[PDB]
Design a protein around this nucleic acid. Structure first.
Ligand SMILES: [Mg+2]
Ligand SMILES: [Mg+2]
Lengths: 134, 128
DNA sequence: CGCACACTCGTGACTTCAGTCATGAGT
DNA sequence: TTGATG
DNA sequence: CGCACACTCGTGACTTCAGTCATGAGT
DNA sequence: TTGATG
């Protein structure tokens, strides 16, 4: 019940739910802009060794569920996703500049949670149920 | 309940497991207890929180919480490397069967952990 | 209201060579 | 140009 | 024997200045 | 000095 992946010095199963918003909370991620964003984020992900498990684009925020290796640090992959998507989106959809002219597509904060198949409470119950704790 | 830092909001939990080198069953009695205390101290000194920790004779389970700035290889190095050094100094008797300079198996097992399941998260992510 | 994850100003790294990440501070 | 997603 | 997360040799980083992490390769 | 934890 776990499907572990293996690398040179480790066995792992790592997933994260990353969410960020549009700067000023403007509702600009619609129609073609949202569609182009999805293609851009997929591309950035593939080039940074991340696997996109789920992606949702709302008018003012984006959700990504990602699978990573132990070597992908969170700040590095968030900078790759948010910084390159902002540059690429303003170049691809110059109309974004009519509501965002200060050089930022994104809110400078990100939200990030680790994700597992079972819950933290089930994992604790499992460890505590073992007989040789000593 | 979500933690906050200068540029991020987060909830990062991991289940980390590693074994004794050669799979020797040496983590018992005073050795096991001394290890738990050493791992808790290393965690507190390196900004990690211990949610749960259990020690079996040949392996350790640790469920810990960290910030986005604490990369996995870095906190695994901090916990395994320093605990080995301290353990051999605190319990010289470990050298009886571990005389090669290693307390631990060089590999580690790590899983991200959430309070809700992936299936529930992934289902709430489409519903909006 | 008064912050702060979000707004603004500031520092440096590094890709996207712009606009994020790191980050302190005032509002 | 802000007011809240996880 | 040959495999590798586990065993061993190798390289470099960096703390714990020893013994992990990074890492490829032969068993 | 190894033989399997998630
Ligand atoms: Mg502040
Ligand atoms: Mg091999």
């Amino acid at each position: 019940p776990l499907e572990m992946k293996k690398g040179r010095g480790y066995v792992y199963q790592l997933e994260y739910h990353l969410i960020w918003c549009v700067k000023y909370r403007h509702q600009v991620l619609v129609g073609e802009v949202a569609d182009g964003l999805k293609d851009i984020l997929r591309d950035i992900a593939a080039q940074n060794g991340l696997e996109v498990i789920t992606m949702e684009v709302m008018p003012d925020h984006v959700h990504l569920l990602l699978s990573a290796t132990p070597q992908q640090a969170i700040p590095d992959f968030v900078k790759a996703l948010k910084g390159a998507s902002a540059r690429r989106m303003f170049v691809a959809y110059p109309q974004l500049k009519e509501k965002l002219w200060g050089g930022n597509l994104w809110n400078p904060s990100y939200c990030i949670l680790t994700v597992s198949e079972n819950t933290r409470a089930q994992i604790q119950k499992f460890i505590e149920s073992q007989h040789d704790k000593e």
